[PDB]
Amino acid sequence: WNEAPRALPFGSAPPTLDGSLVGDVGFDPIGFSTAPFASFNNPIYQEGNFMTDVQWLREAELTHGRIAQLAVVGFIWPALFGTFPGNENFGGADAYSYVNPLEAINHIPSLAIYQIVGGMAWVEYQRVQRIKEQGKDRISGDIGLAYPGGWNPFNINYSPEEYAEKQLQEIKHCRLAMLGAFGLFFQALNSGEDIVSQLSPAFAAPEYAAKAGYFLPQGI
Amino acid sequence: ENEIGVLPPTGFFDPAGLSDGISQEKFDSYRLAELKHGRAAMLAVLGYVAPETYRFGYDLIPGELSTNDIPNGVAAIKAIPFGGWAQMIAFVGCVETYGWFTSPTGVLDLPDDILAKRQTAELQHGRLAMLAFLELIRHDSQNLAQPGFDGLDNLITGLPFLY
Amino acid sequence: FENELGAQPPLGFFDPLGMLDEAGQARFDRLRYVELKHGRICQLAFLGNIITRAGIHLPGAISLDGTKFSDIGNGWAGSFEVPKDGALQILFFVGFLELFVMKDVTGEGEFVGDFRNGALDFGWDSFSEETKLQKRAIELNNGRAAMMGILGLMVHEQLGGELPIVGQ
Ligand code: CLA
Numbered sequence A: 001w002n003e004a005p006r007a008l009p010f011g012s013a014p015p016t017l018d019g020s021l022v023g024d025v026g027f028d029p030i031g032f033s034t035a036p037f038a039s040f041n042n043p044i045y046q047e048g049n050f051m052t053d054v055q056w057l058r059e060a061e062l063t064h065g066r067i068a069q070l071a072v073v074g075f076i077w078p079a080l081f082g083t084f085p086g087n088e089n090f091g092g093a094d095a096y097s098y099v100n101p102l103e104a105i106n107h108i109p110s111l112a113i114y115q116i117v118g119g120m121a122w123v124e125y126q127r128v129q130r131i132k133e134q135g136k137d138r139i140s141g142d143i144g145l146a147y148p149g150g151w152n153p154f155n156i157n158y159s160p161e162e163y164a165e166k167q168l169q170e171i172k173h174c175r176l177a178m179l180g181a182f183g184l185f186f187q188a189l190n191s192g193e194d195i196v197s198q199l200s201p202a203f204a205a206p207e208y209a210a211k212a213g214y215f216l217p218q219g220i
Numbered sequence B: 001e002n003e004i005g006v007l008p009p010t011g012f013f014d015p016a017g018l019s020d021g022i023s024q025e026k027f028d029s030y031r032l033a034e035l036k037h038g039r040a041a042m043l044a045v046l047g048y049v050a051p052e053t054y055r056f057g058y059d060l061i062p063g064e065l066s067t068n069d070i071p072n073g074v075a076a077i078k079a080i081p082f083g084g085w086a087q088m089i090a091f092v093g094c095v096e097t098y099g100w101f102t103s104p105t106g107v108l109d110l111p112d113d114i115l116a117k118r119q120t121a122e123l124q125h126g127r128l129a130m131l132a133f134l135e136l137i138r139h140d141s142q143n144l145a146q147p148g149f150d151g152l153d154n155l156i157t158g159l160p161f162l163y
Numbered sequence C: 001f002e003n004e005l006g007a008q009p010p011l012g013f014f015d016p017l018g019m020l021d022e023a024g025q026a027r028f029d030r031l032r033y034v035e036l037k038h039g040r041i042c043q044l045a046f047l048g049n050i051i052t053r054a055g056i057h058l059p060g061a062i063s064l065d066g067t068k069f070s071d072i073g074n075g076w077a078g079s080f081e082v083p084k085d086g087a088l089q090i091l092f093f094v095g096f097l098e099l100f101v102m103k104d105v106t107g108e109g110e111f112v113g114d115f116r117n118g119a120l121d122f123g124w125d126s127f128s129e130e131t132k133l134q135k136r137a138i139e140l141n142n143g144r145a146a147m148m149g150i151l152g153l154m155v156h157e158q159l160g161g162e163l164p165i166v167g168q
């Protein structure tokens, strides 16, 4: 085990880390990288075709981070940018008027829930197919979004160094958004309010403390 | 005589000589028993605090008996029917006897010194948790038998920010 | 077994329980036959259930002693009003079909379940080679679907609730 890596300078890291994957600083005090985490009971497994446990963990981390990145904006946007102009002739009975994110879950018709579930299941199936076909050679991520070779409606082109820095930015924002989504959800649950109604009051004053006003006559 | 689990706070702690001569097999069985009681105590200590703030809404006896209503502590064993206890004991026995719901990917591939230190720390944490569970049980039973005795109120005398 | 029909893109081959592993050929054929039979049964069951729940009911569906067709409900609970001997005749007919033409009586074995009774072909040589595989795969796929879903139609009927599209 290597000693004194970047982050945890007074600890140690397993040798499986190495370099390779972007964003590797050496943070691994427990383990989880020295075990068969992608081969034991994998139903899709394929000897001489799968990747390395660390790449499987990177895929899981990327999935969680992408979901959290979407969730942070999902929490923030309706509070201060207003609700969707919907509920017009929809018969929702102010179903969109709620802003408390944990309250709108019990007022949205099941159509949207099942549409979202099905769409993400389709995307996951595409990811599974790509993972199965790219064998022990997965550029990781896959799902063929806007990079040349797959779908690219805007025709995004980048130099390899641009791709590397974009990957680093993506992973950093993913970790930060995981933390932020956790914090936002638990703050909303604990305070029973959204973020805007929780931060707005602590900006000017409480009413019981501010002075009455200015009542001195002028001109005397 | 000298194996894992010997650290300097003290050093050997065998006053009454419960081992003395014994044998390798008996010592190994004793170590296994100590590790098992220790892990059970740690799980008990962790589980004695969680229900105070969180509660899963499942209806042990569909139609009624909903977790949300059963008491916490040593009073749950009276509320929970015998069928649930039998089912969960059979389930944990299936886990223990067979390899079901167990994965060998948790054995890890740690070096020797790291493994030894981690084992010693595991045993120390478990030894602490044993007495923790003892104190929890004694306080709960004393309070339930006679309310007001040991005037410290509420379950979990520490961590007062829960209430 | 790794290239046979039923192993396609959304999962390629898929044997999580791993019951196949080592085998000859009788097991594969028996599993294919039971899968196809469950298929056919489940599509017919689901189509009947959906056409009954739609609201289109036969006029001559009336039974003994009048028992007008509008009285018949839907589901397992709603089925407990049809004559016992009528369903006895129905089960006689189905067990008969189990002991009837639904069998390789002719002796022709193109694939497991290709009885055809050598007399009622609607056009079988017309299709090209890939068309046969496509049709068999779509029949099997259009099956696995029916099978599971109907269990839900059966599970949801007794569980109670308000599923989408279908009213309940
Ligand atoms: C009396 C009429 C009759 C007769 C003689 C047959 C005869 C036959 N059927 Mg059959 N069938 C019938 C009516 C009949 N069917 C009806 C009305 C249906 C429903 C549409 C079916 C559906 C059916 C299927 C789906 C299959 C057969 C099969 C078979 C063959 C083997 C059956 C076997 O091994 O015994 C049966 C012996 C058993 C021990 C029964 C097994 C029961 C399964 C394993 C579980 C059942 C669970 C139960 C429904 C739910 C329990 C309650 C719940 C609360 C838990 C045989 C030719 C099989 C076949 O062709 O393969 C050779 C086959 O796969 N049948």
Ligand code: CLA
Binding pocket: A067, A070, A111, A113, A114, A115, A116, A117, A118, A119, A120, A121, A122, A123
């Ligand atoms: C369940 C089966 C199923 C499947 C496999 C699909 C599959 C598909 N649908 Mg679809 N759909 C379904 C059911 C299904 N649908 C139902 C029931 C409806 C309503 C009647 C619709 C309505 C619908 C419309 C209107 C459209 C599709 C479209 C599509 C295609 C693109 C999906 C897409 O880009 O969205 C991907 C969407 C996402 C990835 C959003 C996910 C956002 C985050 C991750 C949500 C996280 C959810 C969270 C984890 C779950 C917990 C929260 C929960 C408590 C609420 C794809 C083939 C589109 C298309 O082009 O096809 C014609 C399209 O326009 N569907």
Ligand code: CLA
Binding pocket: B040, B043, B044, B046, B047, B048, B050, B051, B054, B055, B056, B057, B066, B067, B068, B070, B071, B072, B076, B077, B080
């Ligand atoms: C000595 C251990 C022990 C015992 C006897 C009980 C007993 C009880 N618990 Mg409890 N609990 C425990 C530990 C224990 N718990 C721990 C450690 C936690 C923290 C997670 C909890 C959290 C908890 C909650 C939140 C609730 C209960 C409740 C209950 C009561 C109803 C039965 C039930 O649902 O149990 C549930 C028991 C558990 C969930 C413990 C399972 C622990 C195992 C070892 C986890 C195994 C691994 C897991 C499957 C994931 C594998 C991933 C891998 C990485 C390990 C019952 C009196 C319910 C109640 O009404 O209480 C008043 C209730 O709502 N418990």
Ligand code: CLA
Binding pocket: B060, B061, B062, B081, B082, B083, B084, B085, B086, B087, B088, B089, B090, B091
């Ligand atoms: C599909 C599987 C299945 C089914 C059908 C059931 C069915 C049932 N469970 Mg259940 N359960 C299961 C899996 C299942 N369980 C699993 C996997 C777990 C996790 C361990 C549990 C945990 C569980 C709990 C914690 C409780 C139930 C209860 C119940 C009963 C609901 C209330 C009732 O009818 O009281 C009627 C009850 C009876 C007539 C007495 C039944 C006695 C049981 C069946 C004997 C079990 C013996 C055991 C398995 C093996 C022998 C002992 C072993 C040490 C050798 C019902 C019989 C509740 C219950 O029993 O309340 C009374 C309850 O509290 N279950």
Ligand SMILES: CC(=O)O[C@H]1CC(C)(C)C(=C=C/C(C)=C/C=C/C(C)=C/C=C/C=C(C)/C=C/C=C(\C)C(=O)C[C@@]23O[C@]2(C)C[C@@H](O)CC3(C)C)[C@](C)(O)C1
Binding pocket: A030, A035, B042, B043, B045, B046, B049, B103, B105, B106, B107, B125, B126, B128, B129, B131, B132, B133, B135, B136, B156, B157, B158, B159
């Ligand atoms: C790879 C995979 O798949 O999983 C892997 C994951 C991982 C992690 C690698 C693995 C592991 C190891 C595990 C399971 C590690 C978990 C360890 C754990 C959870 C150890 C608890 C200690 C609790 C203590 C010491 C409590 C003391 C409690 C004390 C000292 C008290 O005083 C209690 C107290 O009540 C009193 C008495 C009075 C009250 O008023 C106040 C309080 C409440 C304070 C496995 C097994 O390899 C499986």
